Design a protein around this ligand. Sequence first.
Ligand SMILES: [K+]
Ligand SMILES: [K+]
Ligand SMILES: [Mg+2]
Ligand SMILES: [Mg+2]
Ligand SMILES: [Mg+2]
Ligand SMILES: [Mg+2]
Lengths: 260, 138, 247, 51, 290
Amino acid sequence: QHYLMPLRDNFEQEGIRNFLSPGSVNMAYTEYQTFILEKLNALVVGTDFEQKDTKSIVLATARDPELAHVFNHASMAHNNHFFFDHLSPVPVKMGDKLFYHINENFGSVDTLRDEMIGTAVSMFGPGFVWLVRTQLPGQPVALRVMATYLAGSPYPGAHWRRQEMDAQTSIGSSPQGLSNGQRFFERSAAGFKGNKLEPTAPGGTDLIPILCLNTWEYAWLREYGTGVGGMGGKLAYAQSWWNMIDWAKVEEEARLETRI
Amino acid sequence: GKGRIFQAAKVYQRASEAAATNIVSGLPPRNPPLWLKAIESIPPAEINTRPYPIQHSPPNPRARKPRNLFRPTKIVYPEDELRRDFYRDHPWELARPRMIIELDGKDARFLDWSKGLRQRGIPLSGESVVQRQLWLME
Amino acid sequence: FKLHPYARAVPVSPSYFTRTPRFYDNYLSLEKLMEEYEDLPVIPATAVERVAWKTLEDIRKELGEQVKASEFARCLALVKRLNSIHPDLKPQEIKDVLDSFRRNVQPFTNVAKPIPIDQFGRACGVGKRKASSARAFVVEGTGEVLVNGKTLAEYFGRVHDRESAVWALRATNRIDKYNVWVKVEGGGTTGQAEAITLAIAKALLAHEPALKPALRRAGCVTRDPRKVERKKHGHVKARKMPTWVKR
Amino acid sequence: QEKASLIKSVDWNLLENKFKNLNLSFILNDASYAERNNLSELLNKLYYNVL
Amino acid sequence: DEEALKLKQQIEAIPGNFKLFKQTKAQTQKLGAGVEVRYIPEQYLRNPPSDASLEDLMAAQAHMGHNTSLWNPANARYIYGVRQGIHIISLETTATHLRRAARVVEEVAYRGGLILFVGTRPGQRPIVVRAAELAKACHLFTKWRPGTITNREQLLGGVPLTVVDELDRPLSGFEDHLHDRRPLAPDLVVCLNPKENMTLLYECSLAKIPTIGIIDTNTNPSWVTYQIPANDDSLRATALISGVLGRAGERGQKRRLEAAQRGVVTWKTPADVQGYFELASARAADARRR
RNA sequence: GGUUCGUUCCAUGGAAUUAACGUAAACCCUUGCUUUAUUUGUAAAUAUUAUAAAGCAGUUCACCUUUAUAUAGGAAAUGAU
Ligand SMILES: [K+]
Ligand SMILES: [K+]
Ligand SMILES: [Mg+2]
Ligand SMILES: [Mg+2]
Ligand SMILES: [Mg+2]
Ligand SMILES: [Mg+2]
């Protein structure tokens, strides 16, 4: 069965300094990751996914419509742990290599800050904001910001559930609305018939998530309160998060090829 | 008797006798096979003896000249009657694939049917209802 | 100098009691490499350089064992599998073991010398039959044919033989394009006629090599090897037997 | 091995195949080796010389 | 058409993306949660257990006998009952007999004996080869040639041997012996499917060679010296039994080589080599005077 | 049990592993080609008949079909030769 694993630096015991109280991280990871794994176990208790890993269940249950409920619990457990696994007990100084690509791609580290934080609030819904690394066979490494919805995964092997654009406020009769609507059916029709829209490289090496931001309410509603009056809330939660990012590890997983 | 004479149970007795003395009378015997001392104290087990097999069900008391006394008996549990009742009321429950392949044989260590139908390690199946039923019924 | 007090004979190879010790030792080594380098990527068979692997006979002689065709057929599927590994990622261990399965046999080359054309534009072709041999000198001309100095009609008193002697020119419709000066020897009327057929055909191909597909379907390129069978003792002829008296 | 046949393959070590043009005016005329002019230098490469 | 060029780029990109694919794999593969892996098909070969428990034997399907009609009534002593139309082999009986066979394999290896693991069924080659490797024994995964023991001079005439000391070090000076010597016969035979090769087991009976076998509900238990009542048709039960006996041989070889380092040999020179020493000194004794 | 011109080859057997002879291979004549030699044979000749020493060549390649996936077979004046 799938069991809960400890956190990075005993966050469950002490928690982050000025980002999450030990009681909040307890309700956010222990009392929730355990709840998700209990449901995940019941769904794979007697199937081939019984001994498979979370990410393996994600890629294997991405397109199958009869396993969408299994994808949620598997993808949620993977995304949730991916969030806490990149937090540092003490602020870290951004490396030189990473500090270069961020400025070359987004213009400035402060610009990337507002883009991710701005996307978290602009999304108005529980999800995850990713910092993806895209590198086509001919093009160089390029960093962008991808925002997934409730349990969507950023990996290319699970593009079937790359839930990054709501349909209730993005598909309409307006000029931009019709464009989104066309792309909607173009994906559903292409995916259904098996055709691929964007050619990808083998092994899903195109997109490599490096950083994540969990915007679900169970992670900040208790600590930063609702947010009425401009104090705390989902806004301050995203701001304080930006200070505890493990830029040392973020740069590592990025694997920015040295060319300077 | 088409079968051949297998003396596999007497390899040690036969080999130890052939090694006791030397074929050239008047000389000490040569060294025996290397396996002779290995199984010196591990004799074979008795074979071909027909015992009274385990009686999984009470034998017929009214029988005066019973036959098939040395025949293994059928294993039957109180759940067999229950499984047949459930799966006959829910035939399409057999269409749900079930994995009878064992992982480590330690499934029954985490089964406490006093809680409910959802246990650890096993899926929610017609077997859970039979085990839960048997617990309540006892 | 004295021998060691404790000594016992031990088999060298673990496949001592098997049918073919040397073969299985080499086959199990492949099973170990495949199981170790199975994760490495491969290349589609279309982009795999073709290799001439050894045959079941080359292995029997090399290993001195009576290897089975079925057991070797599956040993050949491994080398083809391991060969499909990417060259750059292929380890040196697999590169060496695979070189021992290559078949470096070269067939003998025997290419015929092309018929030249004399400075005066005449090519000589040679044909043969039962006992005759012909030499035809084909030259650009109007269609005059000579056989041993005599004309085609003064030599062959049978129109069937005349048409067969120059059948190559007739089939290709070039009787009026070349002059032939044949010189035959030995054989008979039909033997010499069919000998000139092959002679002119060869000489004609020296001028227009693109006519061989046509001379094929005309039957002027093939050399007929039929020959009189000798007389055999106990027989009246090559095969005729004397009268056998039962009583 | 005794009852095993032999596959016919060109033996490039045979003196007939190693030199397809047997004229010394071509072999000794700086064909492959650098300045093997002396006919003896050529023969010593082919045969075993006791001297 | 240059359509093949871009395909070449694919063959050229394999070394690149492969290295990148393997790196990213070690990063985000085991993040979500830990998994309790209780069974892996390759576990009986990669890391066989030293001893088999009732749960290991039942999970490996060692208790499933044949149809009740296709039974040798002689081996009704190991049958626990009847269910699903087959005979169920008692799990306690299989465990006891397996621990006993393991002792036999360990002692024969401890006394420097030659063992032979024999599994001829299709999917038994990886199992037998792995077991022989652990025990430093011989393997056989193809059809046994009738007469390889009773007629070993014909079948094993040209197969090379070697003479070794207590530390398995090859000894020099036995060239004349190894050329004029009778081929070797196994000191112990572990057969994983007795029902299919009775020619091998009958030659062991004639040659006075102890044997171990997996006796299924339809197999004759009189063919081997030490029986292991168990299902011989399952590659999962055959791998467990074979792996347990392989650990037994390995554990016996370790003790033999440890005692040798202390100068204690657990065996005596065989009679074959023993006689060579006698006539060898005679040739030295002959030249002693001359 | 298949297969082969063939106890040939493959698979298989609760008994096989091998040896000799025949078989086969090879040899002699014959067929195509390569090199060598040129009189007493060759019209001439920048070498092509003949003469005769050695070497190479086939069921080889292509096509079609193909069992148990082990060993193959067929087509015959209109694939090559
Ligand atoms: K005649
Ligand atoms: K000639
Ligand atoms: Mg069986
Ligand atoms: Mg036979
Ligand atoms: Mg003959
Ligand atoms: Mg003359």
